[PDB]
Ligand binder design. Structure first.
Ligand SMILES: *[C@@H]1O[C@H](CO)[C@@H](O)[C@H](O)[C@H]1NC(C)=O
Lengths: 215, 196, 219
């Protein structure tokens, strides 16, 4: 069972910079059956390199493949805006057991940006039907790693919450996250203080946004 | 001296179509009309000669080609046909002067689990010339990458097995084939029917 | 020319099976081979298996050996992938892929890809969403909560598309109820709240739901 490990998980660079992506195999594999793919967020995979070093038809000269044995490399000599995507390597040697790497994301490097934190109480419309969804928004932050912690009556609330993150913005290269705490109306009315606690590298101290129910 | 067609027709084991056997018939006689009017064969089509006239004629040499194919492939054993068997296994010339004989061989070449010992050529870089045998087992290189004896992407074993099972239909059943070819050159005629 | 066109999206209930087609044109399909790959949203590529078009010989990843079948139809130049006993973990986009081949030679990599086929495995039924306002309190934030719909997707616009700057429509999350839920937010100048209308336009095709929710500032 041949395993392909790609590193780094994320590459944070600027347009014009050199990108060096790595794909390591648990055993030695034939260069003739190692390929590189590009995948923009909404589209299908696209073949970039086959046979470790051969450019597919129409691929720009800035894409280059090298390596042998267990260490394979995809180089992008100078990154263009369209090159910021996710890259996969694939081993297709012999007749069975073909595998992919886990993928490397090439993101736009940016200054650290603290998130703007907003909190939304559940609407009256939703509360009428027996459910309470509290939404906490983290807007336009970089890097992507963030920590959202729900506090209910000054107690850390685990469960009943789900996160979702946008893709990197085309213009300002930031991310935004939304956390939703969803309780029944009965449980929502058993507590008063509903708070959203955000931890991010751009904030020296955790920023808390809160409200009192119906107050 | 009687020509030994029993060795060919009633042979216990038959060759795969890719490795089709060829037996030479040198100097003897035989009654082709008995073979023609025999109910043992489901197909007995002749080309360039009348099956009934063969008893009055004489040739310098006769060849007996034998192999095994599936039922619906017997039609490919004819002049000017195309398909896996005609292009890659056994090819008859356009000016064929001979007879194609075949019968159902299900009682023999079918096992309870499935006889996988009869094979045919699936991949080949070019079509065979008439009366050409290819028994090579090189891995077929579908792309520009050499296989170096390894099967995989764009690298396929050129032979494929027939799935001969008793539960198959008449088309997907084995059929033993015997192809006689008659040639006359400057050398004296040699293989004959009883009339001459 | 030169393409693989896959069948349309599928919503299947657990335990059933799905058969995805992959029709080739513009290249010598008979000489080629087709591999099948799938990908859950925001996840990696996962190899399922492949087939040699000329022979029909198949090889599957042992994870799928018990319930996948890959076939092909020479007459229609179409490759098929049938996955049985569908579980929730099978919800993904399924891709087929093949090397371009000519009369003489095949390319040495999988350079022709299908457009993908979405397969959703779930016991849920088609349901339109509830649309709830996220009301605002220099820059104010407001939005809409699009809750409890099935299946994907929904489209959100603000003021019939007139408002595009600062709009974030988040990916949907699948809840344990089996329904999806997402929020779409926009930041606006807080001086705008008194003199400008903010409406989110939600459309869910599978249920033929079209909603316009006005989001007003609350005191
Ligand atoms: C072959 O076997 C059959 C009986 O199955 C017999 O009648 C025939 O004479 C044998 N020889 C030839 C040449 O057919």
């Amino acid at each position: 069972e041949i395993v392909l490990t790609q590193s780094p998980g994320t590459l944070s660079l600027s347009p014009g910079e050199r990108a060096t992506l790595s794909c390591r195999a648990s055993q030695s594999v034939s260069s003739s059956y190692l390929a590189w793919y590009q995948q923009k967020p909404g589209q299908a995979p696209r073949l970039l390199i086959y046979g470790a070093s051969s450019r597919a038809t129409g691929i720009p000269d800035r894409f280059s493949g090298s390596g042998s044995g267990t260490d394979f490399t995809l180089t992008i000599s100078r990154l263009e805006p369209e090159d910021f995507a996710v890259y996969y390597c694939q081993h297709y040697g012999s007749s069975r057991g073909w595998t992919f790497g886990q993928g490397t994301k090439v993101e736009i490097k940016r200054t650290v940006a603290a998130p703007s934190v907003f909190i939304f109480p559940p609407s009256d419309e939703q509360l009428k039907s027996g459910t309470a969804s509290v939404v906490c928004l983290l807007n336009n932050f970089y890097p992507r790693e963030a920590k959202v912690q729900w506090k209910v009556d000054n107690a850390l609330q685990s469960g009943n919450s789900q996160e979702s993150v946008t893709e990197q913005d085309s213009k300002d290269s930031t991310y935004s996250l939304s956390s939703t705490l969803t309780l029944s109306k009965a449980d929502y009315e058993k507590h008063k203080v509903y708070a959203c606690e955000v931890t991010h590298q751009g904030l020296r101290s955790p920023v808390t946004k809160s409200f009192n129910r119906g107050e | 001296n009687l020509c030994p067609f029993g060795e060919v027709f009633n042979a216990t084991r038959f060759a795969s179509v890719y490795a089709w056997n060829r037996k030479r018939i040198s100097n003897c006689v035989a009654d082709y009309s008995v073979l023609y009017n025999s109910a043992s064969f489901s197909t007995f089509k002749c080309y360039g000669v009348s099956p009934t006239k063969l008893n009055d004629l004489c040739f310098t040499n006769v060849y007996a080609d034998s192999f095994v194919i599936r039922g619906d492939e017997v039609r490919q054993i004819a002049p000017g046909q195309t398909g896996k068997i005609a292009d890659y296994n056994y090819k008859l010339p356009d000016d064929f002067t001979g007879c194609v004989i075949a019968w159902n061989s299900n009682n023999l070449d079918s096992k309870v689990g499935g006889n996988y010992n009869y094979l045919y050529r699936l991949f080949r870089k070019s079509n065979l010339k008439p009366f050409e045998r290819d028994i090579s087992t090189e891995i077929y290189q579908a792309g520009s990458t050499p296989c170096n004896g390894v099967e995989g992407f764009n690298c396929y074993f050129p032979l494929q097995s027939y799935g001969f099972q008793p539960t198959n239909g008449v088309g997907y059943q084995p059929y033993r084939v015997v192809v006689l070819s008659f040639e006359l050159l400057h050398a004296p005629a040699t293989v004959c029917g009883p009339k001459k | 020319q030169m393409q693989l066109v896959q069948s349309g999206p599928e919503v299947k209930k657990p335990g059933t099976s799905v058969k995805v087609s992959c029709k080739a044109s513009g290249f010598t399909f008979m000489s080629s081979a087709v591999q099948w790959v799938r990908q859950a949203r925001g996840q990696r590529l996962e190899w399922i298996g492949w087939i040699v078009i000329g022979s029909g010989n198949t090889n599957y990843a042992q994870k799928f050996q018990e319930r996948v079948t890959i076939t092909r139809d020479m007459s229609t130049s179409t490759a098929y992938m049938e996955l049985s006993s569908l579980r929730s973990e099978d919800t993904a986009v399924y891709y087929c892929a093949a090397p371009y081949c000519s009369s003489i030679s095949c390319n040495d990599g999988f350079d022709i890809w299908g457009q993908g086929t979405m397969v959703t495995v779930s016991s849920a039924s088609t349901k339109g969403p509830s649309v709830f306002p996220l009301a605002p309190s220099g820059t104010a934030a407001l939005g809409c909560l699009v809750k409890d719909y099935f299946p994907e997707p929904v489209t959100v616009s603000w003021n019939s598309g007139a408002l595009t700057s600062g709009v974030h429509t988040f990916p949907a999350v699948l809840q344990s109820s089996g329904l999806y839920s997402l929020s779409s937010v926009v930041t606006v100048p807080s001086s705008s709240l008194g003199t400008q209308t903010y409406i989110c336009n939600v459309n869910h095709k599978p249920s033929n739901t079209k909603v316009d929710k006005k989001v007003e500032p609350k005191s």
